[PDB]
């Protein structure tokens, strides 16, 4: 019904009281594997959940995705007041309580919830993000997966402040509906860290210099809320 990503205009986005402080628990979370999907890097996880906020119940974390561009100042999927970040990380959660599978979740409008964490290149070597960079050797080829071989805690990638926007959109490939949670505050990384992501390959062959998607028009019946 409404395609993702979009541009979130702060002037137009309203402030709703139902958007309470978000309960984020990635204490149980641990990465199982890392993948080169042909489009992007994707880390799969076991454990952890999100809750509270505007959610009717907790949604269990499923996967992590990473998006980037050919230029350091233009790589996010989502924009905020027509501003684009260096890259975007998506965290896909699903309704384990209601539905008996992730594939059943995709089929429904209340099935998926996707957090967005922005990456901004700021001349700061992120100690935590480097642990993902160290795995990129094992998935250089297109459509290859290796087990994630490192101690890694996901809640070290959360921003400083956790105020957020939210809207009914879709998954990036438009395969299913998904309620987005967009954190305006980004996390800091170095250019050399993102540089290694461009040395991955894809479906003739060519390096993945960029994998983001261009924004869409906000529908008449789609409003963006704010914490």
């Amino acid at each position, epitope marked *: 019904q409404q395609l993702s990503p979009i541009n979130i205009e702060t002037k137009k986005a309203i402030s709703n009281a139902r958007l309470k402080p978000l309960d984020i628990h990635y204490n149980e979370s*641990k990465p199982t*594997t890392i993948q080169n999907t042909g489009k992007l890097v994707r880390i799969n996880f076991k454990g952890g959940y999100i809750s509270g906020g505007f959610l009717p119940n907790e949604y269990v974390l499923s996967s992590l995705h990473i998006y980037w561009g050919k230029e350091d100042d233009y790589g996010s999927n989502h924009l905020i007041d027509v501003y684009k970040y260096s890259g975007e990380i998506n965290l896909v959660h699903w309704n384990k309580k209601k539905y008996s599978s*992730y594939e059943e979740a995709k089929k429904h409008d209340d099935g998926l919830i996707i957090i967005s964490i922005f990456l901004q290149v700021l001349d700061h070597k992120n100690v935590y993000f480097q642990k993902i960079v160290n795995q990129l050797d094992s998935i250089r080829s297109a459509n*290859t*997966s*290796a*087990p994630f071989d490192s101690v890694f805690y996901l809640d070290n990638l959360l921003p400083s402040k956790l105020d957020y926007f939210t809207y009914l959109g879709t998954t990036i490939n438009h395969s299913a509906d998904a309620v987005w949670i967009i954190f305006p505050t980004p996390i800091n990384i170095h250019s050399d860290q993102l540089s290694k992501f461009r040395t991955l390959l894809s479906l003739k062959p060519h390096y993945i210099t960029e994998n983001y998607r261009n924004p869409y028009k906000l529908n008449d019946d789609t409003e963006v809320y704010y914490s």
Partner: antibody
């Protein structure tokens, strides 16, 4: 739909050699790690070995290492298993299957089916 | 590295069965559960701990806590009399393993 038509071997002399094969259809074989599982008559399931999509990583049991070897051809869309120096304890039904959905690109639930298997009897 | 499950479990029709596996890498790695009937290949009942395939009855459900993973069959039917094996990788993620296998015998 998914089908894992496990062709391959049969009777072979002890210490001999064989090459099983597993043709696949219904899902992107290229994206999955693939694995061989065996099951002796009236016995449990034993994982034999697995292989990475490109074939740059292969892992076996902490026995059977120096004589078994996996291969695969993604164009012909099939999994293979050379096995030399065969024993009586290698007498089993050999199953071709994807086990791990975390080690697979665009993972689907449908691709966890198992085939019928090929009986490998080792006897003098 | 091996996955430990009880070789035998006995239940009566209409009762809630529970078959549990143990392993050091279960905090890291997901498990799978395969039903096997006489003269037939293994078939998945539950995957990734708690995800049921289409076709499998709602009776079958899976839960996880720490180093244990527990397949659960509610209102068990005689249909369900079969061996159930749990499947997982070691903590490196390279060496795949099956459990000993649990013979689920239905009484009465």
């Amino acid at each position: 739909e998914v089908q894992l038509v496990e062709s391959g071997g049969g009777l072979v002399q002890p210490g001999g050699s064989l090459r099983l094969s597993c043709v696949v259809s219904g899902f992107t074989f290229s994206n999955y790690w693939m694995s061989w599982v065996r099951q002796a008559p009236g016995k449990g399931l034993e994982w034999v070995a697995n292989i990475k999509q490109d074939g740059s990583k292969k892992y076996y049991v902490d026995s059977v290492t120096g004589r078994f070897t996996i291969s695969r051809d993604n164009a012909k869309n099939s999994l293979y298993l050379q096995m030399n120096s065969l024993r009586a304890e290698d007498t089993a039904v050999y199953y071709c299957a994807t086990l791990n959905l975390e080690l697979a690109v665009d993972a689907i639930s449908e691709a966890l089916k198992w085939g019928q298997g090929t009986l490998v009897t080792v006897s003098s | 590295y091996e996955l430990t499950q009880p070789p035998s479990v006995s239940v009566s029709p209409g009762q809630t069965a529970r078959i549990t596996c143990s392993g050091d890498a279960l905090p890291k790695q997901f498990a799978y559960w395969y039903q096997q009937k006489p003269g037939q290949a293994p078939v998945v009942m539950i995957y990734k701990d708690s995800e049921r395939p289409s076709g499998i009855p709602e009776r079958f459900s899976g839960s996880s806590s720490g180093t244990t993973v527990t397949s659960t069959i509610s209102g068990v039917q005689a249909e369900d009399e079969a061996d159930y094996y749990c499947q997982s990788v070691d903590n490196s993620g390279t060496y795949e393993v099956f459990g000993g296998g649990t013979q689920l015998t239905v009484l009465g």
